[PDB]
Every structure is written in C-alpha cells, then in structure tokens.
Design an enzyme around this catalytic site. Structure first.
Site, PDB file in Angstrom:
ATOM      1  N   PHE A 102      53.370  16.080  -4.320  1.00  0.00           N
ATOM      2  CA  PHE A 102      54.806  15.980  -4.140  1.00  0.00           C
ATOM      3  C   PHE A 102      55.072  14.881  -3.134  1.00  0.00           C
ATOM      4  O   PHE A 102      54.634  14.967  -1.992  1.00  0.00           O
ATOM      5  CB  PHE A 102      55.380  17.281  -3.588  1.00  0.00           C
ATOM      6  CG  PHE A 102      55.100  18.476  -4.440  1.00  0.00           C
ATOM      7  CD1 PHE A 102      53.821  19.048  -4.489  1.00  0.00           C
ATOM      8  CD2 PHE A 102      56.126  19.045  -5.187  1.00  0.00           C
ATOM      9  CE1 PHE A 102      53.575  20.149  -5.299  1.00  0.00           C
ATOM     10  CE2 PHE A 102      55.891  20.154  -5.981  1.00  0.00           C
ATOM     11  CZ  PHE A 102      54.618  20.706  -6.034  1.00  0.00           C
ATOM     12  N   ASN A 122      68.945  32.857  -9.621  1.00  0.00           N
ATOM     13  CA  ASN A 122      68.386  33.800 -10.591  1.00  0.00           C
ATOM     14  C   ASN A 122      68.241  35.183  -9.933  1.00  0.00           C
ATOM     15  O   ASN A 122      68.584  35.345  -8.764  1.00  0.00           O
ATOM     16  CB  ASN A 122      67.083  33.274 -11.239  1.00  0.00           C
ATOM     17  CG  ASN A 122      65.899  33.220 -10.286  1.00  0.00           C
ATOM     18  OD1 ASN A 122      65.814  33.987  -9.335  1.00  0.00           O
ATOM     19  ND2 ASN A 122      64.965  32.312 -10.561  1.00  0.00           N
ATOM     20  N   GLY A 177      70.217  37.462 -19.827  1.00  0.00           N
ATOM     21  CA  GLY A 177      71.491  36.741 -19.770  1.00  0.00           C
ATOM     22  C   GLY A 177      71.961  36.371 -18.378  1.00  0.00           C
ATOM     23  O   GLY A 177      71.212  35.767 -17.597  1.00  0.00           O
ATOM     24  N   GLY A 220      67.768  26.431 -15.738  1.00  0.00           N
ATOM     25  CA  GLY A 220      68.754  26.866 -14.742  1.00  0.00           C
ATOM     26  C   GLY A 220      69.786  25.781 -14.484  1.00  0.00           C
ATOM     27  O   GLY A 220      70.994  26.046 -14.429  1.00  0.00           O
ATOM     28  N   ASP A 221      69.306  24.540 -14.352  1.00  0.00           N
ATOM     29  CA  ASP A 221      70.191  23.394 -14.146  1.00  0.00           C
ATOM     30  C   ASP A 221      71.149  23.257 -15.325  1.00  0.00           C
ATOM     31  O   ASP A 221      72.350  22.988 -15.141  1.00  0.00           O
ATOM     32  CB  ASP A 221      69.384  22.097 -13.972  1.00  0.00           C
ATOM     33  CG  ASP A 221      68.521  22.095 -12.714  1.00  0.00           C
ATOM     34  OD1 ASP A 221      68.840  22.813 -11.745  1.00  0.00           O
ATOM     35  OD2 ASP A 221      67.521  21.348 -12.707  1.00  0.00           O
TER      36      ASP A 221
END
EC number: 2.7.1.20
Lengths: 332, 332
Positions: free
Chosen positions: B124, B203, B236, B264-265
């Site tokens: 990273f 989430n 959902g 998610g984005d």
C-alpha cells in the site's frame, strides 16, 4: 517500398522496453515473515516511497542515442500504456514508428520493494515483451531503408533469435548485445546469436560465460565477428579486433557511484553514436565512457542530463584536450 | 466568489483516489519462501498477468454518480499520474476541478500478487492521499456555490476530520461514510465524524464496530444524524430514521458473484444520485441496489456498464413495474 528517401545513419535498437517501479518499506519484512505460515502467506506492506523509472535495454539505448543527436529507431514491443514513454522518447529524437503495441498486454514491468536491511521482494511482468517475436525488421527496411546497424539487445529470447536471423537474411549489420540473457540462454541458443556480428558487446564476466556455455574458444568467436567490445567496470573497456589488435580505453573518473543501473546501455549508446558519426574505435570508446559515467552518477537510467560544455571539459580531463576536441567536433 | 451561477444539485465526493495493480503468480510463493532466510529475504516472482483498476472510494463513487447522470465533483488528492484517470472521469461527467495534484507524490496505489493457492503479497502506497488534508472545501464553495451534499469517504484520517469540521463551519450537508477506516480510527476519532451528518453509511459489521469503539448506543448516534443507512449484504439495506422508522429494501438478485470490490461505493452512489434526483428513501435504495449488483457482476470497480433498458427491466423484476417506472423517470 522506400527507395528514393532512405535513412542515412540510422541505428535500429531491438530489445526490451520496460518500466521499473521501486518502493521503500521503512521497517523490516521479517516482522511479518517470522510469525507467518509460509505455505499460504498473507503479507501487506505499508510503503513510504515510490519511484518509477523508464527502462528496458532498448529504451535506454535509444534514449541515449537520441539525446546525443544520433539517428535512431526503437524496435520493440510494448503495451498501450507506452503512450507517455513514447512521447518522452520522441522529444529526444527517437523514432518510435516501429514499436509494436500489444492489443492485450501491458508494457513489461519490474516491481521491487526494499526494506531497511536491504531485503527485497520483487516481481517481473513480461507483458507485451513476448510479442517482440512478431516484429518484422523487413517492415523497418520498407519504411526507412536498411539501417546502418541493428542492435540485438536483451529481449524475449525468441525475438533475439528471430531478429538475428532476419538481419542475416536481409543483409543488415548487427550488434550482438545479449547482456543479462547470457545467464539464461543455453549454449546452443547463444551460438545462434553470434555469427556475422559487426559488434559483440558484453562485460568481462559475461564474456567468460559466453565462452563457457558455447564451448567456443576466444579464437572461435573472433573468427565470426568484426569486433569484440568488453567492458571491465572500473578498468575501462577492451576493443578487440579479429586481427589480434586490442585497444584499451580507461573510464572517465566519476564523482559518485550513485547507481550502476543502465551504465552498460549508456556505454553502448555513446560508442555506437560515435561510430555512426564517423569516429574511430578509440574516440568512440572515449565518448561511450563519458555517457557511461553520466548514467553512473544518476538515479535511474534515463534521468541523466546532457550538457555539451561539461562533456568537453570531462573528456579533456580523462583523455586530453586533443581527443576531447575530436569528439565534440561531431556532437552538439 | 460565484453568487449568480451556483450549482443546483452537486454532490462533492471526498475520499481516496487510488489504483489497484493486481498480478498473478502461476506457482506457489512457498517454493521460494521455504528455503529462504527470513531475516533478509531476496524474493523474485515471475508473474503472468497484470490487471490495473481505477479506484479509491471517492473515484468509485464519483464515477458512478457521473455515469448515472448526476452532478458531481471529485474532491481528493492525487499525483501528476492522475492525468489519464482525470480524462476517464471527465468523459463520464465528473468535475475534477478540485482534485489536488501533488508536486512530489504519485497517486495512491495498492499492489497485490496472488499465487495458485491464493497466498498474497501486497503493498500500500498512500502517496498523494496524505495531501488531502490541504484541500479547502471553501474553495469548492467559492467556485460552484454550496454543494447539495459532501460525502466524507474513507481518506487520509486527518482529511476526514478536517472535511467534516469544514462542512460544519460552512454549513454544508454531509454524509459520514468512513467504511474501512472504522477498523483503524480510535473511538475518539470516530466520534468526531458523526455529529450533524445528513447520512451515516456503513455495512452491518461496521455499524456494530462504530457503536463498540465510540461507546455510543444506537440512540446516542440516531440523535445526532438525519438517517442511518446500513447495508446487510445479501439481506439488502436498512434505512433508519431518527424517529424510529425503518425502511428495509432487499437486493437486486445477481446472476453472478463476480467481484464484491466496489459494491458499497456503488450502492452509495446510486442511492445519493436517487436522492439528488428527488426520489424518496425506498426508491433511492432500490436504485442503489441496482448499481450495487452491476458492480458485483463486474471485475474491478469502474469497469461496469450502464444500460438504461436493462436497468428498467431488472428494477421491475426485483421491485415491481411501478417502482421501476418511478425510478427510470428520473434517469436516462
């Protein structure tokens, strides 16, 4: 078929086109490795530096010939991501018309992460390099006429063979320049690269390796080539002719040993640029030695600068004012 | 100061802008690791595939809002190498005027090499991401007027704090969208991200983690925000209002589980695009769920396609023809 508008002194450079992505890990890789289960690792390193260098042996040699004002065409395989590298090279006078661009693969890439203790974890992605075997030198000849010289640099092994064969077929003078591939090609493969070469370039260890692997004596090799050029690190370079004449030229003294990467490519470029400008063997080796030291003093392989006046002065320091005058006479 | 020509429905997306470079090693990393001396490794892997994906949470969200026809400005930090990514985004209608370009660092990068047994070695490189702390939302407001919403996505932690503070100072509606940073920020740091949020996205595991680390009860959080949006994977999404009303919307059934990266984005983008187009909470979640499944069915995060007719049909399958009609009425 270009018959009336052929090139006059073009060096066509074949070989690898790549980039190098170098990252620094501030800690020790051992910190995550010691507690790891080696049969399925999950290693993740937070790095704090990324340096990207344009490279490949053909990219490096073409860059240098271009910078020096030579006529040069880069002939290798790259991906669509080569676009920025293409612009970089064209700005230095490199003809990139005959770079093959892959429809599927990216430009070759070396990635290396180095830790505080100089441990290293690296990857090599050949990508588009493997498609160099699909390049036809006949297409170069159709476009620009026969080049003055084709350099057969380290590349996809099959491409090295095919390019050499095509130079023989088409009657193109070539330089056998296998460098690091000598440590991976078989004796049989190496023997195919040599016969008829105008130049054979290697360093001293590579020369010994070539003889060992091929089973050839020095005499067997010299009978097949027009000139052996063997670099000797800090001891300079030997130019050996098939008549048994040897010309030895010492290095241009360095002010730092910053990064040896690309120095061999730089020597070859400077030497062959000198030859194409009409300089003799000694003067060409003197020029090659200057370009070599500029690269030694620079991080990366194409990140060095060319200054005409500094070149004249440094050549004079190393080789005397007369040699310097004769070299800069063909440069700008 | 733009007073007479302000933007009408602009979502300003803050967060990380990165790329992901994914390589495949055909063998087992264990082959070189087992005989290795772990206190100074020298590992070199010949890989046979390289895939590059455009990413970062802000890049992904801005891409999706742009594709869907929303008004969107990307507000994050990148390097000069962002140029091609900038062109990619502008072609999808993303305003990139307020991307900060570092003078020294490259765009953030995740590099991962995976072997035949799914062992992984990754790096990273944050690069320019750390300079997002130097972005002033006041400059966005001067140029285009107050955005309708500022998304505070995962980013340089200091930038997340500073952007939230600036939204409070300037009176800009914001979405707290910390996602993966919840697993690295302290309770104290997380508490600073929440008060006054128009939306809190997470989430289900991240929601539990937020409560645990902050020491807050659900009631403590709900008293501070206008809407909680909690995704539940295959179950959902819950939309929870501070009055204790809950709207639950199921997923759009997938035809493949190709790659969960960026889902998610995509949900957030589709939902917030729906909100900016005047759709209610249920309809906006239905739209978000469609964009989410398109990303689930695609390798990478911005490599999915938008087809209007397929969207209408799939929305109808999942939610009925009436809901589909109301959603596509605001799309094209």
């Amino acid at each position: 078929e270009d018959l009336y508008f052929q090139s006059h002194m073009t060096i066509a450079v074949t070989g690898s086109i790549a980039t190098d992505h170098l990252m620094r890990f501030p800690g020790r890789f051992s910190e995550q490795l010691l507690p790891e289960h080696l049969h399925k690792v999950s290693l993740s390193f937070l790095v704090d530096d990324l340096v990207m260098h344009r490279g490949g042996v053909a990219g490096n040699m073409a860059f240098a010939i271009g910078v020096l004002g030579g006529e040069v065409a880069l002939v290798g395989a790259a991906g669509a991501d080569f676009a920025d590298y293409r612009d970089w090279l064209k700005a230095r006078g490199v003809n990139c018309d005959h770079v093959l661009i892959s429809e599927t693969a990216h430009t070759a890439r070396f990635t290396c992460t180095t830790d505080v203790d100089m441990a290293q974890i690296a990857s090599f992605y050949p990508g588009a390099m493997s498609e160099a075997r699909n390049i036809k030198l006949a297409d170069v000849v159709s476009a620009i006429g026969k080049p003055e010289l084709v350099i057969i640099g380290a590349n996809d092994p099959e491409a090295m063979f095919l390019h050499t064969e095509e130079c023989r077929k088409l009657g193109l003078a070539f330089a056998a320049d296998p460098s690091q591939q000598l440590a991976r090609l078989s004796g049989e493969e190496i023997r195919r690269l040599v016969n008829g070469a105008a130049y054979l370039f290697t360093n001293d260890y590579e020369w010994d390796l070539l003889l060992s692997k091929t089973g050839w004596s020095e005499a067997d090799v010299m009978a097949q080539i027009d000139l052996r050029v063997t670099t000797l690190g800090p001891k300079g370079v030997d130019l050996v002719e098939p008549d048994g004449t040897t010309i030895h030229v010492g290095v241009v003294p360095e002010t730092s040993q910053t990064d040896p990467t690309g120095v061999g490519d730089a020597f070859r470029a400077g030497f062959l640029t000198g030859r194409s400008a009409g300089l003799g063997l000694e003067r060409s080796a003197q020029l090659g030695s200057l370009v070599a030291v500029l690269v030694l003093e620079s991080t990366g392989t194409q990140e060095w600068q060319w200054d005409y006046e500094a070149a004249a002065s440094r050549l004079a320091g190393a080789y005397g004012e007369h040699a310097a005058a004769e070299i800069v006479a063909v440069l700008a």
